[PDB]
Nucleic acid binder design. Structure first.
Ligand SMILES: [Mg+2]
Ligand SMILES: [Zn+2]
Ligand SMILES: [Zn+2]
Ligand SMILES: [Zn+2]
Lengths: 41, 76, 44, 100, 62, 42, 474, 285, 339
RNA sequence: AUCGAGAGGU
């Protein structure tokens, strides 16, 4: 069950995992990924 | 012609302005109250009395005019 | 007396010791006030 | 400037009342004086006002009984206050010494 | 920016302490179990330290 | 005396020369602070 | 077309000066001057002003000569040579505000000299104008001709535009701080000795007779009534069925929830119609700093206890909401009469919540009671946020409420709750649900678009109705 | 004839702290001491920097400000002379009477950065120094090749012109409290209610008895004049179980100093300048 | 967790539903929609702080950097994750809502003149003036101009002086004055010589300058008052800024009050790890929690404190609400407006 | 100097 994870673990997670988002993608990912396609493929 | 015989504020402002402009053109005062710093006070003390050298000439929309001296008119 | 462009000092006054430069009527090294003072109030 | 630091102007209508203007002073002086003028029997009315909040000047008004003029009281108060301070200074000094 | 010299409300002198904040914090002290041992006790003053962004380390590098 | 933007080199500047670091060729030059004394009231 | 004289700067508050006085910065006063003709009654004043190099230039005939450094000869006085004097204490100017229908915004005020760069406008001039101290800009002009000087000093002066040609009552309405101070001062009828003496200082005359002579523990103790008396003019007789005065001697003063403002308005109107405008201006200039000082000692502030939820009353309001949500199913289907009945029921529940909320000490003294806007803005931020989705507005599309909100409530909520459109239970003091925030943002956008149209189209309407009413004069 | 007779009684003293307890005077005296300490007791601090080589990352007018606020030992402050007076000088450099100059110079010539602290301000009167307290107040940080060289002119001032020149990190007083418990109404309450009266006190003034389990004021000094214990009582019903009101002589003053002037000699120095004030407003005759 | 079966996905955090400029506002769901809209559209853009790490390689027309910038005490989740600090531009100011002699009416702000001199809200404005030459940059055969037409680094340039001199030269206009901070000259491949001079002015808040908080309220400084005159507190903390009690009911920002309370509780000494420091927009700390913190700190549960009048020393009857709030300074200064 | 556009406080 999702019981034995607890309500702490799973709201640690939810911050651990949105720092991660903001590491992979960042905050201007959109613009960049587009230009880097016009000029590639 | 006029039964109320009340002076309008616009004519009062006009006559005070022209009196100050007249007293500001190297002219003596009719009353013996000289020595002020501004001509506005002189004009105010002059209109506060009854002796005014000029009067007002009203106009009628019908195409005529009626004279009214300031000596018979009263000021609030 | 002095000449245009000299560096003088404000001897007596609220602004004392300030250094200033004499535009024509002195101007202070780092503030925007153009003050005018007589010779007795100015020093090398 | 040199205008006298303190100036006196008698009030015409009410006898035994006057106003004193003290230049370059503020609420530090006024509140101390007011409260000692109110320690005196003869004084009837006492207060200070800053003429405009941004100008450093206070005007002090004193109304007194026949037994004392306004000037007397004002001067009396100041003298009295001064003497108080001296008592404190002496006292404090004594204590610091003791502590050491 | 570098720790301001004196607290902006009461004028204590705090500009002497930055380093010992950081150091203590690099042990295991909760901020506030530290800001205590640096003996700041009014909260006008425990603000100015808990809320400073350093920005001189960087400005030096670039 | 101006100092080159991308490497440190200093040169006097001749009127009309396209501004170029003589030595390296980039064209950004910054003026330099002499020792003159300035008083700021604190 | 452009104009010569001009001045625009940020305005601030200054309640420790007369109403006819307005501040001016240093550079503005130094640049602009005031034209005046040489007279005989001021022969020495003009000389003692021109020798010390305060003027800028002077025009003789058809040529202009400056007053800068370089002149080794004395400037002899001549009635033909006009001079423009730097503006000092004793000059009159009129101001122009952002466009407002009222002509009361234009007013003549005496200039005041100071060192700062901003303009000082007393809070008493906020009702004739429309400028709050939030960053508004004004256009302060300067009269040049002496005839224009007389025109601006007689017509645009405050001593003549007191009677409003729009509402009929005095435009010098009551201020927030003034009303608050008067209320917190009337709450305590009797004062101490030092406190009473310190307030009178700002009065006009002394206070010989005390109200309470001797008591058990207190000696000479005055009241606020004698302070208002010494603030009142010398002789006056109001007789307004509630207050009697005979030579600065107030007899009775009733106390209510909001009738004090109307009572003092009747008082000031009677004072104006009896003696004149100058007496009312002096009374206001003597009452404002006194009241500002009275409050300052006391203090007023709002804490978190004032916004108390009172969980019992909160459950009562929730039960009332559950009872009132039943007719919500038959609102947007039958007609608009049920909508008006729903508005009446919401108004009743809002009045109930306001009566349950005004039990505090600060909210009752700081917020109006008879005004519906104040009640709405107070209830909407404490509990039972009002309705925010209606079908009368044509600014938005009906689909947003026909096939969007129901699907949102069915996706997000467990129960159906189809009647959950403007029956939101959250408030601003507590947490707001995301759907509630969405509906509130929709309502705010609707308000903003309506406001922009409300500012745009009535401008054209005023232009149209003004292009025709410019030639009607008695 | 009319004259109060105040009486002090110090509790702790150190060079920075001092907690004295004035009794028998009006608040209007204590407020005056506060006010004058905060903003007339004069101090000496830097007031015209003149910089010749700044190469650092911080601009010049952020070095100036920072310098001024540095606390400088000023025992001699009351004996100097406000420059605007001294007519023994043009206002530059040492003037035994009115100004004292402080040269500073530094240039980093290694790798690891150099903190131009305050222990690097050198003066020429060996009286006015900077206050030492363990490393001093960083005025800039320099990286290799960067230099600061400045000459400064200290002066004497009153903290009502800028607060560079003000010798106090908060002086303050507290009307000492007077607490009376009705002691028989307080017999009415059950134990629990009491322990929810105790613990509704923000601070800790009150406190239960070990034995009789009675509320026993156990530290009158710590009562910020909130109204909490009182208003909880009203609610519990029993009104006026506890009434607490200021005594209106006894104050307890607490002075703390920037280090420029020792605490002791801050107070004494205040009393002294007050006298000099008062004695200027005598109207003679 | 309450009902695991009925849900297929779970949102990471309700605070992420807002933008970058809105997900960091404390108690964003506790204010009016128009107010938070204004704060996230204009007050956030006009806030002056933190401009640039390398400021020499940039020659923009106006820039403005805070002398001593600060981070806020409260932590939204979003700022914590992004781990960027330029999000908040301002300083923490201890405010005590109260009426001060009627200089604070109608949205005006009154501030200590000694916190503004001990350094707070001080900014520097570097403005660059530019010119181009294919007229050679020269000195027309003012006096701060050197043998190349450019003023010496360090000079003080007034409103009538010639900043760039081209054998016709650019003259500074009215509101332009300062100390030359950088003279950079460069050219392109087309043979067009460029040149820019940057002038620096340092400013302190002066009357007429607009301030704004994180929750919408916006006002103009109207009076600057000495430390002594302000009401004090038993500890001695005089309020840095005082704002009208009246403004809070009319505006619908129950947030400002709530934030201030959380912050005080965070900053106050306790007599230590269970402090609640988070005010994320849709999971705000409760009012019962905010207030049971202040209590443990030692201050009054509801956030108000006893204040003793400065001018007289007498306790004042009404407890005042005082706490630390995050304020911002707008770029619209009073000096430019005056003409 | 001129024009146009964009972004703003009211
Ligand atoms: Mg506005
Ligand atoms: Zn502090
Ligand atoms: Zn190179
Ligand atoms: Zn000297």
């Amino acid at each position: 069950n999702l019981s034995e994870l607890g309500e702490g673990f799973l709201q640690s997670f939810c911050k651990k995992a949105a720092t991660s988002f903001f590491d992979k993608y960042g905050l201007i990912s959109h613009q960049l990924n587009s230009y880097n396609y016009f000029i590639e493929h | 012609r006029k039964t109320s015989k009340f002076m309008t504020k616009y004519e009062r402002a006009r006559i005070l302005g022209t009196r100050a402009l007249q007293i500001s053109m190297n002219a003596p005062v009719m009353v013996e109250l000289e020595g002020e710093t501004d001509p506005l006070e002189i004009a105010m003390k002059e209109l506060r009395q009854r002796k005014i050298p000029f009067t007002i000439r009203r106009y009628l929309p019908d195409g005529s005019f009626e004279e009214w001296g300031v000596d018979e008119l009263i000021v609030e | 007396t002095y000449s245009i462009g000299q560096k003088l000092r404000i001897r007596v006054g609220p602004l004392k010791g300030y250094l200033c430069r004499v535009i024509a009527t002195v101007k202070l090294d780092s503030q925007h006030k153009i003050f005018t003072v007589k010779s007795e109030h100015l020093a090398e | 400037e040199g205008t006298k630091k303190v100036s006196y102007d008698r009030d015409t209508k009410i006898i035994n009342a006057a106003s004193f203007t003290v230049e370059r002073e503020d609420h530090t002086i006024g509140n101390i004086v007011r409260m000692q003028l109110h320690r005196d029997e003869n004084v009837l009315f006492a207060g200070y006002q800053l003429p405009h909040p941004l100008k450093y000047k206070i005007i002090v008004r004193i109304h007194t009984t026949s037994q004392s003029s306004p000037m007397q009281a004002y001067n009396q108060a100041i003298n009295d206050l001064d003497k108080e301070l001296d008592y404190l200074k002496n006292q404090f000094e004594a204590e610091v010494a003791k502590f050491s | 920016m570098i720790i301001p010299v004196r607290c902006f409300t009461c004028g204590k002198v705090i500009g002497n302490k930055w380093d010992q904040y950081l150091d203590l914090l690099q042990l295991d002290y909760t901020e506030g179990d530290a800001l205590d041992a640096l003996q700041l006790v009014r909260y006008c003053c425990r603000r100015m330290l808990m809320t400073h962004v350093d920005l001189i380390e960087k400005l030096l590098n670039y | 005396t101006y100092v080159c933007g991308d490497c440190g080199q200093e040169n006097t500047l001749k009127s009309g020369d396209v501004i170029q670091c003589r030595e390296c060729g980039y064209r950004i030059l910054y003026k330099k602070r002499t020792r003159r004394v300035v008083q700021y009231e604190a | 077309k452009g104009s010569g004289f001009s001045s625009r700067s940020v305005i601030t508050g200054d309640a420790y000066r007369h109403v006819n006085e307005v501040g001016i910065p240093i550079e503005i006063a130094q640049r602009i001057t005031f034209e005046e003709r040489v007279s005989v009654h001021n022969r020495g004043y003009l000389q003692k002003l021109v020798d010390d190099k305060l003027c800028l230039s002077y025009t003789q005939g058809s040529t202009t000569y400056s007053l800068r450094d370089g002149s080794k000869g004395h400037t002899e006085l001549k009635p033909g040579q006009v001079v423009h004097r730097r503006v000092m204490d004793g000059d009159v100017v009129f101001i122009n505000r952002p466009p407002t229908t009222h002509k009361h915004s234009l007013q003549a005020l005496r200039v005041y000299v100071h060192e700062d760069n901003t303009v000082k406008i007393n809070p008493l001039m906020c009702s004739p104008l429309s400028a709050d101290f939030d960053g508004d800009c004004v256009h302060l002009f300067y009269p040049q001709s002496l005839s224009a000087k007389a025109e601006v000093m007689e017509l645009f002066s405050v001593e003549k535009q007191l009677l409003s040609s729009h509402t009929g009552q005095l435009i010098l309405q009551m201020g927030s701080d003034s009303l608050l101070s008067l209320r917190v001062m009337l709450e305590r009828v009797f004062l101490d000795k030092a406190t009473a003496q310190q307030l009178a200082m700002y009065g006009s005359l002394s206070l010989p007779p005390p109200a309470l002579r001797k008591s058990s523990k207190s000696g000479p103790a005055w009241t606020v009534f004698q302070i208002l008396q010494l603030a009142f003019p010398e002789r006056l007789s109001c007789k307004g069925d509630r207050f009697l005065v005979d030579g600065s001697d107030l007899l009775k003063f009733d106390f209510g929830v909001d009738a004090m403002g109307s009572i003092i308005n009747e008082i000031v109107t009677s004072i104006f119609l009896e003696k004149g405008p100058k007496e009312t201006l002096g009374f206001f200039d003597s009452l404002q700093p006194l009241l500002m000082e009275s409050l300052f000692a006391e203090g007023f502030s709002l804490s978190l206890e004032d916004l108390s939820m009172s969980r019992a009353d909160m459950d009562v309001i929730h039960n009332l909401i559950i009872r009132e949500i039943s007719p919500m199913v038959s609102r947007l289907r039958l007609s608009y009469r049920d909508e008006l009945q729903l508005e009446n029921s919401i108004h009743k529940v809002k009045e109930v919540a306001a009566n349950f909320m005004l039990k505090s000490y600060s909210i009752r003294n700081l917020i109006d009671i008879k005004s519906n806007s104040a009640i709405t803005k107070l209830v909407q931020q404490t509990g039972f946020l009002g309705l925010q989705l209606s079908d009368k507005k044509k600014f938005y599309t009906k689909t947003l409420v026909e096939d969007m909100a129901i699907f949102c409530k069915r996706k997000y909520g467990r129960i159906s709750s189809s009647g959950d459109f403007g029956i939101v239970k959250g408030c601003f003091f507590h947490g707001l649900d995301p759907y509630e925030e969405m509906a509130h943002s929709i309502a705010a956008r609707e308000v903003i678009v309506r406001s922009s149209r409300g500012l745009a189209e009535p401008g054209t309407l005023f232009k149209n109705l003004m292009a025709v009413l410019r030639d009607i004069v008695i | 004839t009319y004259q109060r007779f105040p009486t002090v009684k110090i509790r702790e003293l150190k060079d920075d702290y001092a907690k004295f307890e004035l009794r028998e005077t009006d608040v209007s005296m204590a407020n005056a001491l506060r006010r004058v300490m905060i903003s007339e007791v004069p101090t000496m601090a830097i007031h015209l920097v003149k910089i010749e080589v700044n190469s650092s990352v911080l601009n010049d007018e952020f070095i100036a400000q920072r310098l001024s606020l540095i606390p400088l030992t000023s025992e001699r402050a009351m004996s100097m002379r406000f420059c605007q007076d001294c007519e023994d000088c043009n206002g530059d450099e040492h003037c035994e009477f009115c100004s004292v100059e402080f040269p500073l110079s530094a240039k980093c010539v290694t790798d690891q950065t150099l903190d131009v602290t305050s222990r690097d301000l050198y003066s020429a009167d060996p009286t006015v120094t900077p206050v030492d307290f363990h490393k001093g107040i960083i005025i800039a940080k320099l990286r290799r090749g960067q230099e600061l060289k400045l000459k400064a002119l200290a002066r004497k001032g009153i903290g009502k012109d800028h607060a560079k020149w003000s010798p106090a990190a908060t002086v303050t007083y507290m009307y000492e409290p007077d607490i009376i418990i009705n002691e028989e109404m307080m017999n009415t309450l059950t134990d629990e209610e009491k322990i929810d009266l105790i613990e509704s006190s923000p601070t800790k003034v009150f406190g239960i008895d070990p034995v009789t389990g009675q509320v026993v004021v156990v530290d009158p000094e710590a009562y910020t004049y909130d109204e909490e214990v009182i208003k909880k009582a009203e609610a519990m019903g029993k009104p006026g179980l506890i009434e607490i009101h200021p005594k209106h002589d006894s104050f307890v003053f607490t002075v703390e100093s920037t280090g420029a002037l020792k605490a002791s000699q801050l107070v004494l120095n205040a009393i002294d300048i007050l006298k000099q004030k008062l004695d200027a407003i005598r109207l003679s005759d | 967790l309450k009902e695991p079966k009925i849900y297929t996905h779970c949102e990471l955090d309700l605070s992420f539903l807002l933008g970058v400029s809105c997900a960091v506002v404390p108690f964003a769901n506790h204010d009016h929609g128009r107010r938070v809209l204004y704060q996230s559209q204009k007050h956030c853009q006009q806030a002056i702080g933190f401009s640039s790490t390398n400021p020499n390689i940039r020659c923009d027309t106006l820039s403005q950097q805070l002398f001593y910038p600060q981070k806020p005490l409260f932590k939204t989740l979003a700022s914590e994750c992004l781990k960027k600090e330029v999000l908040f531009n301002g300083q923490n100011a201890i405010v005590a809502v109260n009426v001060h002699l009627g200089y604070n009416q109608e949205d005006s702000i009154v501030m200590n003149k000694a916190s503004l001199e001990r350094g707070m809200f001080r900014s520097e404005q570097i403005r660059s003036y530019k010119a181009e030459v294919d007229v050679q940059f020269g000195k027309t055969h003012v006096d701060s101009l050197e043998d190349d037409g450019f003023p010496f680094i360090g000079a003080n340039m007034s409103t009538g002086d010639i900043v760039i001199g081209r054998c016709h030269s650019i003259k500074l206009k009215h509101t332009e004055r300062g100390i030359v901070q950088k003279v950079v000259l460069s050219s392109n491949d087309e043979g067009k010589n460029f040149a820019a001079v940057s002038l620096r002015q340092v400013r302190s808040p002066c009357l007429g300058d607009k301030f704004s908080s994180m929750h919408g309220q916006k006002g103009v400084l109207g009076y600057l008052e000495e430390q002594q005159n302000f009401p004090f507190t038993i500890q001695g903390i005089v309020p840095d800024i005082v704002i009208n009690p009246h403004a809070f009911p009319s505006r619908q920002t129950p947030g400002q009050l709530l934030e201030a309370a959380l912050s005080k509780g965070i900053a106050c000494p306790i007599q230590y790890t269970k402090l609640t420091r988070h005010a994320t927009p849709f999971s705000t700390p409760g009012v019962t929690e905010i207030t049971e913190q202040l209590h443990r700190a030692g201050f009054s549960r509801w956030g108000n404190e006893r204040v003793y009048n400065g001018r007289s020393g007498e306790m004042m009857r009404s407890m005042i609400f005082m706490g630390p709030t995050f304020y911002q300074r707008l770029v619209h200064m009073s000096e430019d407006k005056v003409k």
